[PDB]
Design an enzyme around this catalytic site. Structure first.
Site, short mmCIF file in Angstrom:
data_model
loop_
_atom_site.label_atom_id
_atom_site.label_comp_id
_atom_site.label_asym_id
_atom_site.label_seq_id
_atom_site.Cartn_x
_atom_site.Cartn_y
_atom_site.Cartn_z
N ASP A 35 185.60 78.25 25.62
CA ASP A 35 186.49 77.97 26.76
C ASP A 35 187.44 76.83 26.40
OD1 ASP A 35 187.66 77.61 29.17
OD2 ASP A 35 185.88 76.77 30.17
N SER A 199 206.05 77.41 28.42
CA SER A 199 206.70 78.65 28.04
C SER A 199 208.18 78.60 28.40
CB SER A 199 206.01 79.82 28.76
OG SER A 199 206.70 81.04 28.56
#
Length: 330
Positions: A35, A199
């Site tokens: 994770d 992004s």
């Protein structure tokens, strides 16, 4: 040193991926959920409340000659999905794919929430976010990667998750045969303890690319892609009959639909998520309403590039003094 381990989807939907991890001496192999959005290595154990164990493999520290109680240390974690676990702490030898760390904090669960009990395939979590998020008290502990970093050939790990197939976590090296083209690296902020990046935009299907900054985290422990409501609405508007369902808890779509791809930007590069990666199947057995793999982050407080996005890429987690993330197509 290096390590390399295969990671395998737990079910036919790729809801999560499990990777075998050797703990203790002799080794006890547990299948952990790696994770990159958390920083605790915790396991089901011989100390876990018996009624909360349902098929998981447990770590028994009393059977490990290298286990040592970390005296006074406790841990307690709550995840973004509302699940939680807590317990005490041992140090022990932990190996992943041939890479061994001695003295790793292994957080032994005394209690786990129902979602963990109900998932017999996941024996615990191995956190790969920054150690500043580790919950051990009163002495915060380091992640497996942090402990291994200095010994690694290069201070990196890579995630290469498969679509409906196994993939690979590598530590200490870049497998240049595992991706196509080049890797585009992008800046990371560690201020929240995550692999947080920005992004450069998105496209829906064959549509034009929209240049817009989308800050979010690269999180292998989250199944879906969680993005701003504007972006998510633009995606689902291209699927006839798709709608947000408050009762189901997100966007659903007719199982008869063909889904468009979704592209996200990494610098000037582009990662394309095929439409089929966005199908999470019937909302309940036999239903013709299917659950979408792109969902709004509006109720979370952060955008999350979970498995839906990451499995479309070869992803480099560069833990150099100034960390960065790399993405390549594959």
């Amino acid at each position: 040193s290096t390590g390399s381990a295969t990671t395998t989807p737990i079910d036919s939907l790729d809801d999560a991926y499990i990777t075998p991890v050797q703990i203790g001496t002799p080794a006890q192999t547990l299948n952990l959920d790696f994770d990159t959005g958390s920083s605790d290595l915790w396991v089901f154990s011989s100390e876990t409340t018996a009624s909360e164990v349902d098929g998981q493999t447990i770590y028994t520290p009393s059977k490990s000659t290298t286990a040592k109680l970390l005296s006074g240390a406790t841990w307690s974690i709550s995840y973004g999905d509302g699940s939680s676990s807590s317990g005490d702490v041992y140090t022990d030898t932990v190996s992943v794919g041939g890479l061994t760390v001695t003295g790793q904090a292994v957080e032994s669960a005394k209690k786990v929430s129902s979602s963990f009990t109900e998932d017999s395939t996941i024996d615990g979590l191995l956190g790969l976010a920054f150690s500043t998020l580790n919950t051990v008290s009163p002495t915060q502990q380091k992640t497996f990667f942090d402990n291994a970093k200095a010994s690694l050939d290069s201070p990196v790990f890579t995630a290469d998750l498969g679509y409906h197939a196994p993939g690979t976590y590598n530590f200490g090296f870049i497998d240049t045969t595992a991706y196509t083209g080049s890797i585009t690296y992008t800046a990371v902020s560690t201020k929240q303890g995550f692999w947080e990046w920005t992004s450069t935009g998105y496209a829906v299907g064959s549509g034009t690319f929209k240049s817009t900054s989308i800050d979010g985290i690269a999180d292998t422990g989250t199944t879906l892609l969680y993005l701003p409501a504007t972006v998510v609405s633009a995606y689902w508007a291209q699927v006839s009959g798709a709608k947000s369902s408050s009762s189901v808890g997100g966007y659903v779509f007719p199982c008869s639909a063909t889904l468009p791809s979704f592209t996200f930007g990494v610098g000037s590069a582009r990662i394309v998520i095929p439409g089929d990666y966005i199908d999470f199947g019937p909302i309940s057995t036999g239903s013709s309403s299917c659950f979408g793999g792109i969902q709004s982050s509006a109720g979370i407080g952060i955008n999350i590039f979970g498995d839906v996005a990451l499995k479309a890429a070869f992803v480099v987690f560069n833990g150099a003094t100034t960390p960065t993330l790399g993405f390549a197509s594959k």
